[model samples]
Target chain A: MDIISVALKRHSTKAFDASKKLTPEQAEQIKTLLQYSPSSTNSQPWHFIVASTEEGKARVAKSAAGNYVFNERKMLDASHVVVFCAKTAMDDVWLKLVVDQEDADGRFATPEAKAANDKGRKFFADMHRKDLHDDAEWMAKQVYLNVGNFLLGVAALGLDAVPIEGFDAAILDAEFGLKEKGYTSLVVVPVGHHSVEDFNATLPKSRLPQNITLTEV
Target chain B: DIISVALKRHSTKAFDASKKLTPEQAEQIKTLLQYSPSSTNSQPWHFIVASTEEGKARVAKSAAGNYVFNERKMLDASHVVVFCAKTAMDDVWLKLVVDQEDADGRFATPEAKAANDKGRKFFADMHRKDLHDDAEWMAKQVYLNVGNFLLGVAALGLDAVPIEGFDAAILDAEFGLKEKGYTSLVVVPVGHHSVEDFNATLPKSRLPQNITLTEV
Candidate 1:
C-alpha cells in the first residue's frame, strides 16, 4: 500500500471489537515490525511489553484508570496492548552491547573500522548523557520513532490501533515491574479491530491545512 | 508492499541541488506533514519548508560554527524542512483542536462530546504540570511525525535525511519561532541524491534484532 494512503486512511480507533483477536501469525508480524523500527545511531533504546493475556491486559488497564481513565476501557477491550518503554539511561553497558552487536552484524570491515564505530557511537551517547543532560529524553524520543513505525505497520495490516500517551507512567512502571528491569513506560498502543460503536471510524481525520502548517521559505 | 518503507529508508548525506521537487510532489509532501499523527490528535507542530535560496541559506547558517558540523547540503537540497513544536499547550490551541474535531463530526453524541473535551483537556493539563520539560515533550511528538514523514517521503521515491546536529536556539531565533510559539527540534533536507553521494551505496547499519526487540 502507498504510505500516503495508509497515513490518510488510518484513524485512532476509539473502541475495539473485543471478539476479534489478532492471530498468532499476525501478532508475530507486528512484533517483527517493532523489532526493525529505526532509531538514532541504531541506539534502539526501547523495550516492548506485549499484553494479550487476561492478566496482562487487566494490569495495563488498571494503570490506565484514575487520571487516565479515558483509556482504561480501550486498554481492556483491545486485542493487545504494547507498552513501549525507554531505557532509564544509555550507560556504558548498553553502549558496549550495541557496539558488540554492530560488530557481530558485520557492520565493520576491519578491527580499525570497529574501533572507529565504537568511538563515534560512544561520543554521541556521552554527549547526550553528560553534556546535553538529555539522556532519558533522547532515549524516549527514539522509542517514539518505533511507535511511529508500529502505527503505520498496523494500518498496513488492515488493523485498527490507537497510540496512547495518557496513561500514568508511575502506575504502569509499578504494575509491570519496569523500574527493576531498568525501563520506563513512555507510550502505550492498543491494537485491534475497531468496534461498530467507534465514532472515530466515521469521523473525518482532521488536520491543519498545508498552508497553515507548512511555510515555504 | 506492506509499508516497509521504514526498513528501506536511509538518511541521505548528499542531495542533488540542481534537482528540485515538482509542484505536485511538494504539495503531496506538505499534506503528509500536516496529516501526521500526534497524541490526543493535538497537532502541535509547525513546519518551515525552505525552498528558496535565501530561506535555505538562512536555515543553513545555524548549522555552521563551533561544535556543530556544517551541513551545507541543506542549502543545496530541494527543500529543507524545519520541524518546530509548540512551546506551550495553551487553551487557545486546545480549543482549536476541539473545534476542528467537532467540525469533523468526531463527537457523534452530546455525551461523546463532553467526554472528549474533558479527556483532551485533562491530558494536556497533565502534560503541562507533570511533565518536567514541556518543550521536549512537544518535540518528542514532533519526532513521531518526522518518522511518518520520513517513511512517506521514501515511499514517494525521494531522497531525504533527518538532521538534528544544528543549534536549535540559533535557528529558532533566526526564524523568530519563539514569537510564533514554536521551537525547532529537527531539520530534514529532501531532494534527489547526488551522483557522488557516498552514503547511498553503503549498507545501512542498525542494532542487532535481538538487542532492540524484547518481548515480555
Candidate 2:
C-alpha cells in the first residue's frame, strides 16, 4: 500500500476493543519497527517496554491517573502499550556499545574506519553533554523520532494506535523502575483495533491549511 | 506492501541537485506535514521551505561559521525545510486549536468539548513545570511531524535527509522566527540522491532487536 495512504488512513484511536488482541506475529513486527528506528549519529539511546499483560498495562496506567486521568482508560484499554524511554545518560558506556555493535556488524572497512566512526559519535555526545548541557533532552528527542516510525508501522499492520504524551513521566519512571535501569519514559503508545465508541475514529482529522502552516522562502 | 518504508528509508548525504521536485509534489508533501498528528492536536509547528537560490543560501549560513559544521547540501537539495515549534503554549494558541476542533465538529457533545479544554490546559501546564525548557517540549512535537514528513517522502519515491546538526539559533534569527512565536528545531532536505552519494550504498546500521525491545 502507498505510504501516504497509510498515513492518511491512520488516526489516533480513542477507544480500543479490549477483546481484539494483536497476534504474536504482528507484535513481533512492531518490535522490529522500534528496533530499526533512526537516531542522530546512530546513538540509539532508547529502550522500549512493551506491556501486553493486564498486570503490565496496569503498571503503565498508573502514570496516567490522578490529574492525567483522561488517558488512563486509553492505556488500560489497548491490547498492548509500548513505553519509549531515553537513557539516563549517553556517556562512554553507551557510546562503546553502539561503536562495538557497528564494528561487529562489519560497518567499518578497516581499523581506521572504526576509529573515525567512534570519534565522530563521541564528538556529538560530548557536545551534547559539555557544550549543550542538555544531554538528557537531546537523547529524549531521538526517542520521539522512533515514535514516528512506530505509529506508521502499526498502521501498516492494520491495527489502530495512539501516540500518547499525556502521562506523568516521573510517575512512570518510579512505577516502571526506569531510573534504576538507566531509562525514563518519553511517550506511551497503545495498539489494538478501535472500538465503535471511539469518537476520534469517526471525526475528521483537523489541521491548519498549508498556507498557514508552511512558508516558502 | 507494508509500511516497511521506515526500514527502507535512510538519510541521504549527497543530492542530485540537477533533479528537482515538481511544484505539485512539494505541495502534496506540505499537506502531508500539516496533516501530521500532535499532542491534543495543538499543531504547534511552522515549516519554512527554501527552494530558491537566495533562500537556500541564507539557510546554509546557519550551518556555516563558528561552532557549526559546513553543510552545503542545504544549498544543493531541491528543497530545504526548517521545522519550527512554538516556544510558549499561550491561551491564544489554546483557544485557536479548540475553536478549530469545534469548527471541524470534533466534539460530539458539550461534555466532550469541556473535557478537551481541561485536558489540553493540564498538559501544557505539566509540560511547562516538568520539562527543563518549553522549547524542548515544543521541538519534540515538531520532530513527530518530521517523522510523518519522512515517511510521506519515501512513499512518494523521493530521497531526503533529516538534519539536526545545524545551528538552530542562527536559523531562527535569520528567518525572524522568534518574534513570530516559533523556534527552529530541525532541517530536512528532500530530493533525488546523486549517484556519487556513497552513504546511500553503505549498509544501514541499527541497534539489534534484542537490545532495544523488551517484553513486560
Candidate 3:
C-alpha cells in the first residue's frame, strides 16, 4: 500500500545535496534490490556497474562530460551512481547458464521440465535476436524493468533518484570497457537525498489527464 | 517493503476470475499508471484498461489463433491494460506535455520553462533525427512505467501478467490505435490467482547477485 506513497513521494531530483550520503545499510539494500529484480522470461540479460567513491563516480561521470554535462553533477555529487547495462547478445551459452541456475534453484522437477524451460527461453531470445533482429532493444527492456524496480526500491529505503538516459553510451561503454565485457550501458541512475534547493521536490507531478491516457473500456 | 514484494511477486500463469478489483483498488491503480514516469516527462503512452466483460473480450481479440494461450488469461482476469506507445513523436506532442507541466507549476520562470522545453526537445530530436530510434526509445520510457505498475500492483496484494504475445495488428486495428497515432506495446492482465496456478509458489529465479552486479 505504501508503495503508492513511495511512487508519489519521488520526483526526478533536479539538484542534489553534495553533503548527503546514503547510510551503508541503504547502499547494501540498493544492491539487493537490483539482484532480485524480475526480467522477461527470467532471461536476466543485464549487468549493473555501481560507483560510490569519487574516482569511481568520476569515471562514470565522464559519460556526462561534453554535451551531456547536465547529468554530471547528479552522478558526481550523489551517494552512489549505477550504470545499468544490458547484455550485447543473449546467446546459447547465456541461455544455458540461466536454465542451469533455474535447475539449481529447483524451478524444474522432471528432466523434460528443464528441457521445456530451456526451449521456452531460447525461443523468445532467438525470436528477438535472429527473427526480429532487435535483441539489444529487447534485452534493454528487461533492464528498464530493473530501472523501474530500482527507482521505487530506493524510494522505499528513503532515498532519492533520477533515471538518466541522456548520457553518451559510447563514452560509458568505453569508460567501463562494457563492449569488451559483452555488455552495454542503457541507463545511469544517481541515488541519494535531495538538496533543499531542488525545486522539483515539491512540484506537483505532471501526467496526461486521466481521460486522455486511460479509457475505461 | 518493495524488496519483500519483489521477492514475493511472481507472474500469474492463470487467474481466479471470481475475484475482481474493488472500486478503490481500480482507482488507485489507474492513478499509479498516470503518475508513471517517462523520459523528459513525455508521458508518451496511453492505457486501455478493461474492467468489464465487454472490454476484456475486445482486448482478448488480439490473443486469438496462434496467440490463443493469452486468450483465456485475458478473458478470466478482472482487468487487462493494453499499454500503447506513440508511433511517432513530434512537436505537437511535446507542446502538449510541456503545457501540462506548466499548468502543474513545474517551471519557476519563463526562462526556466524555455530551458525545460529546449532540453526536452533536444533529446527527443536527437533520438528522432540522429539515432532514428525514436519509437524504441519512447517505448523504453514506458517500460519504466511498466516496472512501476508491476510492483505497485503487487503492493496492493494483486497478481498481474505482463504480456507481449498478442497480435499487434489485431489489437491496434481493434482499438484503432494507429489512426489515433499509437501502437500497443504490452498487455497486462490483473486479478487474484487461481488455485490451479502453480507458478506462484516457485521462488523468483534471477542470476546470482554476484553474477549480475558489481561495485567499484
Point to the candidate with the largest DockQ. 3
lDDT of 1 by residue, A120-206 (tens): 777778889989888999999988878877887788788899998878889999987888988999889999899987878878888
Which candidate wins on TM-score?
3
Top-down TM-score ranking: 3, 2, 1
Off by over 4 Å in 1: B66-70, B108-114, B130-132
Full candidate order by DockQ, most accurate first: 3, 2, 1
2 against 3, candidate with superior DockQ: 3
What is the alpha-carbon lDDT for the whole of candidate 1?
0.82
Per candidate, native contacts kept equal 0.57, 0.66, 0.78
Model 3 interface DockQ: 0.79
Alpha-carbon DockQ of candidate 1: 0.56
Runs off by more than 4 Å, candidate 2: B66-70, B109-111, B129-132
Q: Model 2 over residues B1-216: C-alpha lDDT tens digits?
A: 444666677788889888999988887778778878888788889999999989988888888654254376787799989988998888888888888888888888889988889888777776776654656777788877887777678768888888877888889889899899998888988998898676777777777868877787
lDDT of 1 by residue, B132-188 (tens): 466677788898988777777887888888877788888999999999999998888
Q: Native contacts recovered by candidate 1, as a share?
A: 0.57
Candidate 3 residue spans exceeding 4 A from truth: none
Clashing pairs in 2: none
